[PDB]
Amino acid sequence: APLPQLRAYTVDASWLQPMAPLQVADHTWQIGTEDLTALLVQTAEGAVLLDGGMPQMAGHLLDNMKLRGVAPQDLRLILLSHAHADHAGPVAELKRRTGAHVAANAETAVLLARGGSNDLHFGDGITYPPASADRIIMDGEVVTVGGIAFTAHFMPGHTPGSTAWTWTDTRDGKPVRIAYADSLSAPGYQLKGNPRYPRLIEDYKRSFATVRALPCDLLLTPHPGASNWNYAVGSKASAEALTCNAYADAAEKKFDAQLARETAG
Amino acid sequence: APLPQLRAYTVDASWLQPMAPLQVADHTWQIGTEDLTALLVQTAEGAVLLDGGMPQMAGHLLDNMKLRGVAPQDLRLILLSHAHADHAGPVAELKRRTGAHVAANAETAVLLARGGSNDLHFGDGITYPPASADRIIMDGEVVTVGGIAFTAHFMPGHTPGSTAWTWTDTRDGKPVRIAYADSLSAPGYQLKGNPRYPRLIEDYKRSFATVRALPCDLLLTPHPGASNWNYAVGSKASAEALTCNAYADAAEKKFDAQLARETAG
Amino acid sequence: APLPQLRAYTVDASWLQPMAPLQVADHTWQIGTEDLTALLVQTAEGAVLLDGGMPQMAGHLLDNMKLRGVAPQDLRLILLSHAHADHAGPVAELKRRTGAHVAANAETAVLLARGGSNDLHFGDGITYPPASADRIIMDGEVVTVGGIAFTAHFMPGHTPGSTAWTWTDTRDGKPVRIAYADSLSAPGYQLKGNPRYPRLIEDYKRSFATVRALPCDLLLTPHPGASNWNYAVGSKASAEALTCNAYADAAEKKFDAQLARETAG
Amino acid sequence: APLPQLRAYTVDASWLQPMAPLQVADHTWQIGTEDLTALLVQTAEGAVLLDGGMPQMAGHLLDNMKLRGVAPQDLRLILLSHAHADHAGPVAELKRRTGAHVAANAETAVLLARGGSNDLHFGDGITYPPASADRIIMDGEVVTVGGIAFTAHFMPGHTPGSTAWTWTDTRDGKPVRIAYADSLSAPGYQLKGNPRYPRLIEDYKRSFATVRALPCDLLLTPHPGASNWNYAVGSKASAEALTCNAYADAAEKKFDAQLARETAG
Numbered sequence A, B, C, D: 001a002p003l004p005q006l007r008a009y010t011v012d013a014s015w016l017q018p019m020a021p022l023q024v025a026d027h028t029w030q031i032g033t034e035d036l037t038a039l040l041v042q043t044a045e046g047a048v049l050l051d052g053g054m055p056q057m058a059g060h061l062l063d064n065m066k067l068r069g070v071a072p073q074d075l076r077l078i079l080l081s082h083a084h085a086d087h088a089g090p091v092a093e094l095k096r097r098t099g100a101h102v103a104a105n106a107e108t109a110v111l112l113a114r115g116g117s118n119d120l121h122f123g124d125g126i127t128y129p130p131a132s133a134d135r136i137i138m139d140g141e142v143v144t145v146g147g148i149a150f151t152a153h154f155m156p157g158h159t160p161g162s163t164a165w166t167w168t169d170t171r172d173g174k175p176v177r178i179a180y181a182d183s184l185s186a187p188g189y190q191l192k193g194n195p196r197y198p199r200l201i202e203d204y205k206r207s208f209a210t211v212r213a214l215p216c217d218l219l220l221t222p223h224p225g226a227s228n229w230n231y232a233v234g235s236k237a238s239a240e241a242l243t244c245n246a247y248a249d250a251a252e253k254k255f256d257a258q259l260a261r262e263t264a265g
């Protein structure tokens, strides 16, 4: 009996179902798929991309940027929620084709440079082309493009580098404080006494409190279902979206239930 | 219609068919699979590994090292023919589990650090966990472990970093100059006017001449079939093996035929 | 008037004054200089080095290891307090000459890979040869060599990656819990409203509390004066050494005074 | 007697003597110092910089770009002759402040990522802030910005990664084939039997022939004196400049004389 074949990272079809740009606020657009968020923020001096989704989405993102009037070279900066294959997948290829810089904290930088390999929980099961961060970000640091200020809020747990990004856009007239909060799932993770992540539970617990305190007129998440968006319904997409408070509290109830189950079995 | 799923790198079963250590000379053993070479050289001051095969072979290699009396921490150095998934696949994991250093030329180092992504010919189709080289090697440089001297001979073409490694072992008494020459295939490559590799044909042509001039009492290749080894027949494995001259000349005839076919269609 | 010349990183002579190995406990030795700590821990299966001091100390460290019976290849692992030139200076050269692996957290890893350049407070004024970390460590993770367990305790502030390392040695018979706590200085730092380190004050404040809670029968610090060691007096070197509590409290009083002075002027 | 202090990399004052932009052709300007070349090429879709000189020149270069109408964000690409402190010195800082990408061959990439440390001949004596290459270039590859095509010609010797860059500009009307050829010095190098560079002499010899064959209506070199430019005399700066043939032949005569002297003593 030979050694087993490598097994591809396959996802639900809706994670790979392309959509046209969906306007979130005056400068902010969802340009990823129906089930993976990729936010384009268009400024007077270039564009910012927050997340890119799966590795095979690079061309779709560039197509949607062009629909928005954004040439590849106009992308100045890539920001990330966390460096897993379904959110940072196409970053290497996007950098090559745009000249964009990547800004991320040290934890996200080292995982991205590994292509998601040697993941604390997934091992080498879910990888993607490696990419290097060009600017290292600290907790609370402000990154500014075209006058739009993006603030990082560290929320470790789902990954050590998990980050929420906040910025204030407008809706026609009035300001809208947008919060792009990272995932709070723990899919198949060993939570208690994890030798690769000894303070995992403490980090999640603090991250729930960080999410609750975010400036947050409008919450978005890497998976739209996590904050109750429906990208397929256009102008009704945000209607049932959760607050940052409700997102944190639902995530913590799920976490507490999984911890109790882990303690049981 | 959604975007396509990622597709795993699958190979012939014999590339993943484990074998027990096969002795090549007094200190040198084939410890990979029936169809992928991985050479262990055991010295008074630790072991050297030349190639590791596929990513999922790391545990098999460590098992065979232990059969040879070589504990994981006793592996001092990893050398590579070239940094493709089926030859350098398990290098990252081997480094983590042994403390070995990797020595390679600059071209092999940059490809390895990318996990084989953005390959000049394969793109992102065939990747593996990224790894960093700890020592950069120049053409003709000598690497010595436990008194055994390994000499690098650059033979670019199959990859820009393709390298032949030579060393002198013994067979009971008499010296045997071993040549571990890299692959000379060009699988699906565009050879002529390649914008990612403008001097590809010149490099292959020079590499044929480098292989012909190697010190070479015994030739081995990353794929045993390439030099006419049969690892499944034990002490008869090397009986029909090619000389370095015959390997180079057969590879150049194949190359010339493919170039003429490329020129035709 | 031409642009100014580059200016070397010069230190007090005692930071570069070599000393013979000074035994701290049964397996632990100070092998750096009179004014820079470099701890060698010798185990049944190889040695661990915690810090190396200045870049030009590599040969002195190897000389002292040899005096201890430790050949260069016997060094298995390098640990760091923080990645500044006077503590991590010779790490690159030590790795090349020993085959050791470096283990560090993500923050220390990214600063080390920059050679201390683009430092949040020093800019490019104080740099050293870059080095890569081979294993990324999480808060509370245990690294074990030869049965001796080293636990990391993150204490950000002096650098984002600042780390205390703890292990239990023996003194003849009885156990001694050693705490190698990092520096808590803020030399010339802007503490309040620092755009490169927005949560600097919160991190220092938490790090004082982390240091107070360390398992700590014997405290050592990267600069011996910081914990009131005198490496020049041999067996009396530790006599007046501070507890972890006193070190934290003295450091916090200094920090509070500097913050008040920063608030004033 | 203590260990010696670190010693700064100091150069002649004229290597740090700033100058205003000196026009070389319709799109090409010398914007470095009187004694260090840094070429700005201005295109319809952004600027290219070839070399930057010393680390402390970053601000001077940005000042000269602004004089040319080139904002920091308008710099798209940095190209290098070779990755030594006096030519690639400010690359890290320029990348941070412009968003430019660096393109270089694998040898130049690995040396740049080391900040020039562990240099084959200089060791750690001459270092600079490390920087990463964003695009790896092959021999003869064409890099295009704003329709202007830059071709790389490898000329190893001074460093393994030494590269000549060629492009065709215009002088008012007529085309001018510019050749920016790298240094061919061997300052204090051991040429014969160098274990860190065994094929050094063969590489230099081939590089003389590469330089002789360059498309070359106008030659420039990293040090203007090497090709007999005088940047201080404005429109007469290129009057006595050497051809590519004469540069190669003078460099080879110097090399041959140094080799004979090395063979003697």
Ligand SMILES: C[C@@H]1[C@H]([C@H](C(=O)O)[C@@H](C)O)N=C(C(=O)O)[C@H]1S[C@@H]1CN[C@H](C(=O)N(C)C)C1
Binding pocket: A084, A085, A086, A126, A183, A184, A185, A187, A222, A223, A225, A226, A227
């Ligand atoms: C298993 C996932 C997937 C993996 C991950 O990022 O952890 C990815 C590697 O495949 N992405 C994930 C994430 O939280 O970001 C996870 S969890 C899953 C995603 N949508 C679902 C959701 O959020 N609901 C509220 C139902 C659960």
Ligand SMILES: C[C@@H]1[C@H]([C@H](C(=O)O)[C@@H](C)O)N=C(C(=O)O)[C@H]1S[C@@H]1CN[C@H](C(=O)N(C)C)C1
Binding pocket: B084, B085, B086, B126, B183, B184, B185, B187, B222, B223, B225, B226, B227
């Ligand atoms: C297509 C391959 C495979 C790929 C490669 O390394 O290029 C790998 C990525 O899947 N390894 C390869 C190599 O030359 O190293 C190639 S060529 C193929 C391997 N054994 C065969 C062989 O060498 N014969 C003499 C029949 C041809």
Ligand SMILES: C[C@@H]1[C@H]([C@H](C(=O)O)[C@@H](C)O)N=C(C(=O)O)[C@H]1S[C@@H]1CN[C@H](C(=O)N(C)C)C1
Binding pocket: C084, C085, C086, C126, C183, C184, C185, C187, C222, C223, C225, C226, C227
């Ligand atoms: C300015 C330093 C020097 C610099 C640093 O590491 O920050 C280095 C870059 O030069 N190392 C330093 C450290 O805290 O680690 C600092 S502080 C200085 C060192 N010994 C002194 C001390 O600790 N006392 C209790 C008097 C103060």
Ligand SMILES: C[C@@H]1[C@H]([C@H](C(=O)O)[C@@H](C)O)N=C(C(=O)O)[C@H]1S[C@@H]1CN[C@H](C(=O)N(C)C)C1
Binding pocket: D084, D085, D086, D126, D183, D184, D185, D187, D222, D223, D225, D226, D227
């Ligand atoms: C010793 C140098 C200096 C060093 C180098 O790059 O090698 C640098 C590290 O300090 N740069 C150098 C180079 O060739 O690029 C060298 S050689 C020196 C520079 N101008 C002179 C010259 O080229 N003449 C024709 C007189 C000789």
Ligand SMILES: [Zn+2]
Binding pocket: A082, A084, A158, A183
């Ligand atoms: Zn995830």
Ligand SMILES: [Zn+2]
Binding pocket: A084, A086, A087, A183, A222, A223
């Ligand atoms: Zn996800």
Ligand SMILES: [Zn+2]
Binding pocket: B082, B084, B158, B183
């Ligand atoms: Zn291959």
Ligand SMILES: [Zn+2]
Binding pocket: B084, B086, B087, B183, B222, B223
């Ligand atoms: Zn192969």
Ligand SMILES: [Zn+2]
Binding pocket: C082, C084, C158, C183
């Ligand atoms: Zn410090």
Ligand SMILES: [Zn+2]
Binding pocket: C084, C086, C087, C183, C222, C223
């Ligand atoms: Zn210090």
Ligand SMILES: [Zn+2]
Binding pocket: D082, D084, D158, D183
């Ligand atoms: Zn040079």
Ligand SMILES: [Zn+2]
Binding pocket: D084, D086, D087, D183, D222, D223
């Ligand atoms: Zn120079």
